[PDB]
Amino acid sequence: MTLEEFSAGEQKTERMDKVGDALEEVLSKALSQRTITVGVYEAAKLLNVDPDNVVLCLLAADEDDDRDVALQIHFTLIQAFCCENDINILRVSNPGRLAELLLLETDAGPAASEGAEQPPDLHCVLVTNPHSSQWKDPALSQLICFCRESRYMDQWVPVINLPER
């Protein structure tokens, strides 16, 4: 008989760790809208399905991706496509923390991975709008702002390392 669950808090600032916190909030809501893509190799598919609707892509690079030449090409491939339609993107340094997010409340559908050793996939998500472009929220505004400043430094892609729970 143990019940002390009551956690809360708020702040109103742009900060580096707040970028990946903010991302987790929006993606959870974006599953609730059912208007998003998932999986690194959907690059060609999403370009042929809803290229006008595309708003932002996320990629999560493993330690194992530093040795996967195909998945490295998949990252620069999806980067060519989003740039062609003017769509910003972000590359997270932490495969485990983005894998935590897909367990919390985004991608809460049939997306779990419990086997021997499956290959690196299900490490990307893409946010897209309906026929009325309304994807803002204060969280994704913080993301766009941060990503624009680091992109201004001649980085073709901004990058970050988001916190644990």
In terms of Cα–Cα distance, which of 157, 142, 165 is closest to 16?
142
Per-position b or e across 92-122, b if 16+ CB within 10 A of its CB? bebbebbeebbeeebbeeeeeeeeeeeebeb
Tell the residue number behind the tokens 């595309």, with chain if given: 54
Residue linked to tokens 């590359």: 91
Q: Are 137 and 26 in contact (CB under 8 A)?
A: yes
80: nearest Cα among 116, 111, 115, 51: 51
Query: To which residue do tokens 């893409």 refer?
Result: 126
Q: Which amino acid is at 132?
A: S
Calpha distance 56→46 (Å, rounded):
12
How far apart, in Å, are the Cα atoms of 91 and each of 35, 58, 94, 133, 141?
21, 6, 9, 24, 17
Domains of the chain listed by start with CATH number: 1-165 (3.30.1330.30)
Cα 141 to Cα 128: distance, rounded to the nearest angstrom: 15
Strands 89-92 and 159-160: parallel
Residue 72 CB partners (closer than 8 Å, separation 6+): 65
CA dihedral 45, 162, 94, 127 (to 10 degrees): 0
Strand pairing class (54-60; 89-92): parallel
Name the experimental technique.
Answer: NMR
